[PDB]
Design a protein around this ligand. Sequence first.
Ligand SMILES: *[C@@H]1O[C@H](CO)[C@@H](O[C@@H]2O[C@H](CO)[C@@H](O)[C@H](O)[C@H]2NC(C)=O)[C@H](O)[C@H]1NC(C)=O
Ligand SMILES: *[C@@H]1O[C@H](CO)[C@@H](O[C@@H]2O[C@H](CO)[C@@H](O)[C@H](O)[C@H]2NC(C)=O)[C@H](O)[C@H]1NC(C)=O
Ligand SMILES: *[C@@H]1O[C@H](CO)[C@@H](O[C@@H]2O[C@H](CO)[C@@H](O)[C@H](O)[C@H]2NC(C)=O)[C@H](O)[C@H]1NC(C)=O
Ligand SMILES: *[C@@H]1O[C@H](CO)[C@@H](O[C@@H]2O[C@H](CO)[C@@H](O)[C@H](O)[C@H]2NC(C)=O)[C@H](O)[C@H]1NC(C)=O
Ligand SMILES: *[C@@H]1O[C@H](CO)[C@@H](O[C@@H]2O[C@H](CO)[C@@H](O)[C@H](O)[C@H]2NC(C)=O)[C@H](O)[C@H]1NC(C)=O
Ligand SMILES: *[C@@H]1O[C@H](CO)[C@@H](O[C@@H]2O[C@H](CO)[C@@H](O)[C@H](O)[C@H]2NC(C)=O)[C@H](O)[C@H]1NC(C)=O
Ligand SMILES: *[C@@H]1O[C@H](CO)[C@@H](O[C@@H]2O[C@H](CO)[C@@H](O)[C@H](O)[C@H]2NC(C)=O)[C@H](O)[C@H]1NC(C)=O
Ligand SMILES: *C(=N)[C@@H]1CCCN1C(=O)CN[C@@]12C[C@@H]3C[C@@H](C[C@@](O)(C3)C1)C2
Ligand SMILES: N=C[C@@H]1CCCN1C(=O)CN[C@@]12C[C@@H]3C[C@@H](C[C@@](O)(C3)C1)C2
Ligand SMILES: *[C@@H]1O[C@H](CO)[C@@H](O)[C@H](O)[C@H]1NC(C)=O
Ligand SMILES: *[C@@H]1O[C@H](CO)[C@@H](O)[C@H](O)[C@H]1NC(C)=O
Ligand SMILES: *[C@@H]1O[C@H](CO)[C@@H](O)[C@H](O)[C@H]1NC(C)=O
Ligand SMILES: *[C@@H]1O[C@H](CO)[C@@H](O)[C@H](O)[C@H]1NC(C)=O
Ligand SMILES: *[C@@H]1O[C@H](CO)[C@@H](O)[C@H](O)[C@H]1NC(C)=O
Ligand code: NA
Lengths: 728, 728
Amino acid sequence: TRKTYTLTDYLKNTYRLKLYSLRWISDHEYLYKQENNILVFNAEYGNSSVFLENSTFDEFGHSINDYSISPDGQFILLEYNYVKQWRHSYTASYDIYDLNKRQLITEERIPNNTQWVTWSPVGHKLAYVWNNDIYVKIEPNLPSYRITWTGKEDIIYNGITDWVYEEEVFSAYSALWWSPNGTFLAYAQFNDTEVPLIEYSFYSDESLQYPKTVRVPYPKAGAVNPTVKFFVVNTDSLSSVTNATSIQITAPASMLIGDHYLCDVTWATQERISLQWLRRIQNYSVMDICDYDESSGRWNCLVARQHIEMSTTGWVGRFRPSEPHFTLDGNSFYKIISNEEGYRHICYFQIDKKDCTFITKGTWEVIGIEALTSDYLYYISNEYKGMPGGRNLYKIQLSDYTKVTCLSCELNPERCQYYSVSFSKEAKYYQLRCSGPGLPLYTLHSSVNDKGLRVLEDNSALDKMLQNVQMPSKKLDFIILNETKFWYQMILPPHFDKSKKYPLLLDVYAGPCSQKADTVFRLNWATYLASTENIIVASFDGRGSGYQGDKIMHAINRRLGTFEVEDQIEAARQFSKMGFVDNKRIAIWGWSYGGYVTSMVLGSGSGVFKCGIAVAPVSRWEYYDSVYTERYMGLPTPEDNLDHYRNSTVMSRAENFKQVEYLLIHGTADDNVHFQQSAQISKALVDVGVDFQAMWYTDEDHGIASSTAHQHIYTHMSHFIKQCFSLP
Amino acid sequence: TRKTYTLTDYLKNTYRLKLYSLRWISDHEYLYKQENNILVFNAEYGNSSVFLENSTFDEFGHSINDYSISPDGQFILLEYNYVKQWRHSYTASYDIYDLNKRQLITEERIPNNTQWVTWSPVGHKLAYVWNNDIYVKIEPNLPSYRITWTGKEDIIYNGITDWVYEEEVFSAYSALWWSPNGTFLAYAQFNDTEVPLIEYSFYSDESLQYPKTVRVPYPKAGAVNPTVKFFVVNTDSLSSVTNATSIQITAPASMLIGDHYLCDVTWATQERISLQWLRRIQNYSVMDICDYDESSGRWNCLVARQHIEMSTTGWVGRFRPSEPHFTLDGNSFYKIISNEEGYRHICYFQIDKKDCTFITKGTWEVIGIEALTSDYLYYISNEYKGMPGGRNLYKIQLSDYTKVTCLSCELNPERCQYYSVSFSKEAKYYQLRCSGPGLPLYTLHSSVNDKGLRVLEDNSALDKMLQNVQMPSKKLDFIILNETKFWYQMILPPHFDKSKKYPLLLDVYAGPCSQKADTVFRLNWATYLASTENIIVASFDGRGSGYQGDKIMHAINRRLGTFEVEDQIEAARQFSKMGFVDNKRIAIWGWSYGGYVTSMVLGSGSGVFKCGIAVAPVSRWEYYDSVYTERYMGLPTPEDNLDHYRNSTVMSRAENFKQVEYLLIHGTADDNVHFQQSAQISKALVDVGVDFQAMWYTDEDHGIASSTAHQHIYTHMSHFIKQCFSLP
Ligand SMILES: *[C@@H]1O[C@H](CO)[C@@H](O[C@@H]2O[C@H](CO)[C@@H](O)[C@H](O)[C@H]2NC(C)=O)[C@H](O)[C@H]1NC(C)=O
Ligand SMILES: *[C@@H]1O[C@H](CO)[C@@H](O[C@@H]2O[C@H](CO)[C@@H](O)[C@H](O)[C@H]2NC(C)=O)[C@H](O)[C@H]1NC(C)=O
Ligand SMILES: *[C@@H]1O[C@H](CO)[C@@H](O[C@@H]2O[C@H](CO)[C@@H](O)[C@H](O)[C@H]2NC(C)=O)[C@H](O)[C@H]1NC(C)=O
Ligand SMILES: *[C@@H]1O[C@H](CO)[C@@H](O[C@@H]2O[C@H](CO)[C@@H](O)[C@H](O)[C@H]2NC(C)=O)[C@H](O)[C@H]1NC(C)=O
Ligand SMILES: *[C@@H]1O[C@H](CO)[C@@H](O[C@@H]2O[C@H](CO)[C@@H](O)[C@H](O)[C@H]2NC(C)=O)[C@H](O)[C@H]1NC(C)=O
Ligand SMILES: *[C@@H]1O[C@H](CO)[C@@H](O[C@@H]2O[C@H](CO)[C@@H](O)[C@H](O)[C@H]2NC(C)=O)[C@H](O)[C@H]1NC(C)=O
Ligand SMILES: *[C@@H]1O[C@H](CO)[C@@H](O[C@@H]2O[C@H](CO)[C@@H](O)[C@H](O)[C@H]2NC(C)=O)[C@H](O)[C@H]1NC(C)=O
Ligand SMILES: *C(=N)[C@@H]1CCCN1C(=O)CN[C@@]12C[C@@H]3C[C@@H](C[C@@](O)(C3)C1)C2
Ligand SMILES: N=C[C@@H]1CCCN1C(=O)CN[C@@]12C[C@@H]3C[C@@H](C[C@@](O)(C3)C1)C2
Ligand SMILES: *[C@@H]1O[C@H](CO)[C@@H](O)[C@H](O)[C@H]1NC(C)=O
Ligand SMILES: *[C@@H]1O[C@H](CO)[C@@H](O)[C@H](O)[C@H]1NC(C)=O
Ligand SMILES: *[C@@H]1O[C@H](CO)[C@@H](O)[C@H](O)[C@H]1NC(C)=O
Ligand SMILES: *[C@@H]1O[C@H](CO)[C@@H](O)[C@H](O)[C@H]1NC(C)=O
Ligand SMILES: *[C@@H]1O[C@H](CO)[C@@H](O)[C@H](O)[C@H]1NC(C)=O
Ligand code: NA
């Protein structure tokens, strides 16, 4: 009998997915790491040469974390002393290696404790942030020019985001944007002076006698938010003036009237930048398009070029307004926006005309715009077979919108229903990355004729390994509720027999615009539960879920902890009705938003679930950050939505936990969902005399992702589920 | 069949011990609160009068926490708005009621948030501490005189202790000492300027959006300690026009050479005060005896009147040097010190002679001196039947030390083997309080011929209730380790059958000078475990335990986490070989020092224990406070005892937890054993891949003592022990 996929398999990564991570350096060449050597590949022919031999930095004296080659290929930026901060942020040391001299640069080094570094998009200028101020080096071995003098720890951030902008607005630590040819450097400045601090203990190595208190400016719902300013500096003037002026571009009057955010920065041309601003009530956004005025040295944004994007049913964008993609001349752009039917499609704008033209339509959504040439726009959508959980690449002819070609749909339709893409610098080539439902498959293609050039990685090694394993299967389908299709997936045990009754674990996330039913191939905890423990692991996309239009997505507007919670309960009831589920053994688990929904479900008194596990749950919306929470909830004030903030807490449901077995887990150094949130759940449970199981993870953050903690948490959870389900 | 003593019985206090808490107000009368009325009793005859009717404060408008009648009976201090701080400290509001004119004083009230208040020992003066400064009121209706002006939150403490002095030196918040007739007020001042702060989160009610950070000056082992000064003020010469003059009494030269503590203050006469000082290396202490100089207004401590107390085998005193008991003229005193055989006995000192004379001797110890007259000294000891865990009252004739009379031994030998005592003002009467092995028994006696006047409370009500419950029994016995007897107790299930095998829980504390094997009657968690669950609950006093001489007590000097741990393992090994113990079901548990020892035992690799529970454990001595830790461990420096600090941690034993089931529990707001200690244990177990059970208690302190948390922890621990022992 073939072995199963065991817990140790998952935790030790015995069965490894191979990737093909390339970095395009031109329109026809990419870099790829093979046996620690960096190789340069010709895309057209597939031949390679050694770009940088793996012995080059043997005598460097530090383990190199990552590298970045300058666009002109003259220098390599070496990243070491990597110290992680939040989801995206980290600090590091940096050295620059001169590739032509084959020599490390030892003068005017990037300082230690540098927060962010980026090459210009052309050539080899560098911008970096150190002690919250911006510096620019025109040449790697020459002195830096200081751009800002206002940086102040935890207070003023120049060219980097604060906590909430990193996590919820930009999905990045960086807050600087080079113009296309590197002449201008645009940047944001955040001011957190009056933003309250989250404070928590960090215990460190056992050698530390007194715990440290970590203090991070973090606006919880309704609290004082950071303010923001936007500036542009001419880097070509730095060597000519003692102190080059950063020119401010102010937000429009419609934004200045109240609290607001900077939510997008996109350069259109060498002398034109677009900015999107979002009101703190996030159903109203404004794009300004601003041109450099050579005579005054200022940036001016004509009101005739200003574009309003608003929502009557919810917030603007999936998580924020979408980015524009400008035509080469910068006089028009394409942007994903919600159409009159509530489906997200590509609209084409002229910069000085307010009405746009939709170039795609239908009951499906465009996921992203991937590339734009003079003749074609390339985008990813879930159109194919009406499956919201699939992804394919399409090409639309700009001179004739009726001509739309699916580039990926039929390449391998059994194996490949979920694609992403990486285009070369001017879109001459593209790499397709298939991520399921079969094993991932990486292929290279030429744009001139859309022909497949070669297979880059087909995971044949893993395929061979998996043939000797009793792997689970995945079912993706839908149920019909109130004449609406809602999609679900099930990870099914090997040799699945529909005449038997299986225990079921509902794996929940269910946040707004989430999607937990898809065609992606995963090797995870669920794989083990199904393969070794014969547990069905199900997920369901109910009201609030994404990629299916605004009627579904905006259903939870101002009402988190309602329909998305109810729909998970209803999904479990419908799974029972299917006949192969032991109704005495239904469980639920989730992380973060999934931890909140798990806890809300367990506290609902539905009687459907025996047990559940919440990891790093939100418990009360007033504890979570302003940008995310208010997007869906508005403000926690009596004039706005306080009543619902107060009605949607886990704590208020404490008495109902007497009916279930609950395991509550949280990292003590979670900067995102504060340990506070679980500390309040446990206290409410103690106060009503509810017994439950708990586990804290010392010094772990939201990811509980250290090697040892990751192994420990899944091991602890596995015991809990197995006990609940009476599994030996 | 009759009922057992259940978990609910323990948690809801179904079976209540009655007390008889009296307050002596003279040599002949005491106060006793009965049905919220305060009565005055005549000791000779037992007749009473109502002193204060319960309905006197019906319209008060605040719930009264406690009361304190002035020594002259003219006034009553009413305590309300009680807010607990640490083990002893709290703040409260106070009102004074005039018992003669039957009215509340509304003039010059004691302020809210008062930290400490006390009547003078004679009359009706008041001293109180507010905002860390001392105030004196000569008459309750008159303005206070401000004594100190330097008080500053968390920095300068006048007349109250800081955290470490409260917990580990004085066992009290007060640092004020009135002279016997109230002329002088002596006080200490603590300076915590350079003492580091422990910081931890406090979550508060759900409504609090951001957790608070609590910061407490707390010296961990080897850190900067508070400094201390001592002063005396004459309260008879205070002025409304001039600031009060406090006279400093400085520490002896032998103390000033390095870090030191003030460890005892005891008035001898109206004009003579004794002080004991202790070096930070706590094996050297000095008593000064200081006389008021009426012509200069100074306090002079003659060097000829200094008394040195030191230890070559350990520290000085059980937890600190003992208090002196001065004769009427103050020219001599009696003090418990360790004799040349290492047994603590009463020594008689002349104030100006170096050599003292021991008045008691033998292989047993004096527990405390209780009263002193010109003819007799009254003391409690464990001499009787050579049982270190029993306690009886004795008197010794001061003119002939061979004449020692036991006053409690034979009163009721079967019921009463553990006594404490409360004497009237000049020792004319005494109340005996028997606390086991039978139900507590309170009796009143006259000293002149040791007549047993009357039974005050015999708990006959509880006896009647317990007749219908299957109660456990208690065996107190000894084992021999290496020619020395060491005592243990077992709480044995009802109908105990030595032909059956019972699971066994070892209930451990095992701190230095601890005693867990005694004759005290207790109704606690162990009562339930034995009565209802048929578990034997054993405790053992091994090396380091108290009341059996220094050979045993000082065995762990400079070596915590060694012999006291080994001896618990050895006791369990011996119990496991008894015919009535199931060697497959032996568990261990304890709180604080007991949590440390439990964890050290579970990490020993002994294989004797299946499971255990540690509650608020110490895990590493460098995390614990200076005064306690250094008493036993010296300083954590390479030149002193660092090596042993480093090899006595729980964390180093983590790998050995692989073969046990462990439950780790800690309150998040424990100001004493910081949550940090358990946070480091859990991290070490995670790092070696050991699974275990955990529970945090949000906002609970060292006691985990709120009604709801208390019920929850014992419920959780009960489930854990029952699961471990396979009990339904
Ligand atoms: C891949 O092969 C091509 C062509 O075979 C290489 O391009 C150059 O080809 C000329 C022939 O005219 C040779 O003289 C050179 O060796 C090549 N140029 C350079 C700059 O090396 C190409 O180099 C190969 N690409 C890689 C990445 O190895
Ligand atoms: C960041 O914002 C704060 C206000 O939150 C600014 O601080 C104020 O500055 C003015 C001086 O121009 C003072 O009069 C106020 O006392 C300050 N207010 C507070 C609350 O501190 C600060 O100048 C801003 N910093 C930057 C670089 O823009
Ligand atoms: C470069 O120019 C900036 C902008 O004028 C200077 O920043 C100002 O510095 C002064 C005092 O040092 C402050 O009063 C202003 O509030 C600052 N303004 C801003 C926008 O930061 C900066 O100091 C100059 N650097 C040098 C070397 O002169
Ligand atoms: C990058 O773009 C910038 C902005 O358009 C160019 O700078 C301008 O160059 C023209 C010459 O064609 C001058 O008339 C302007 O004075 C320049 N403007 C500014 C603001 O500097 C720049 O030359 C381009 N760089 C390269 C390398 O082509
Ligand atoms: C202790 O606190 C109370 C409440 O602050 C004080 O009571 C007074 O009455 C009301 C509320 O009960 C307050 O608004 C007044 O400010 C209080 N002041 C006075 C002068 O009556 C009470 O006075 C405080 N006691 C002392 C001794 O300061
Ligand atoms: C308490 O004791 C003090 C000190 O012995 C007494 O104060 C002395 O009293 C006599 C008068 O009989 C004076 O001659 C001394 O000068 C006083 N000394 C001081 C320091 O004040 C005091 O009388 C006693 N008080 C009571 C109420 O008995
Ligand atoms: C008090 O205890 C200390 C520590 O046990 C003793 O310290 C001695 O003196 C120095 C301290 O640096 C050490 O080098 C010696 O090794 C210690 N002597 C020993 C262990 O015998 C000190 O002697 C003690 N004091 C008394 C009065 O016994
Ligand atoms: C966990 N799910 C917590 C609590 C509720 C929201 N949340 C977040 O972390 C929100 N931040 C993001 C928002 C989206 C989706 C997730 C990844 C992210 O990068 C984009 C950040 C969570
Ligand atoms: N056992 C728990 C923790 C950790 C180790 C010492 N400790 C104390 O609380 C020490 N402080 C005292 C505890 C006991 C015995 C002494 C007097 C006491 O009041 C009660 C405080 C020391
Ligand atoms: C970075 O730190 C190291 C070690 O402290 C030091 O030797 C080096 O000079 C630093 N580099 C720079 C660029 O400051
Ligand atoms: C934005 O939301 C608020 C609260 O729901 C609402 O009052 C306002 O009308 C909305 N704006 C738009 C354009 O829908
Ligand atoms: C007790 O009795 C005596 C004499 O009978 C009496 O005078 C005295 O006041 C009484 N004491 C009390 C406290 O009632
Ligand atoms: C307290 O001690 C500090 C030194 O730690 C000293 O500077 C200060 O004066 C002291 N304060 C008082 C009131 O004694
Ligand atoms: C008493 O001392 C304080 C503090 O030094 C001072 O403010 C006050 O003026 C003094 N009062 C008199 C009467 O000297
Ligand atoms: Na009697």
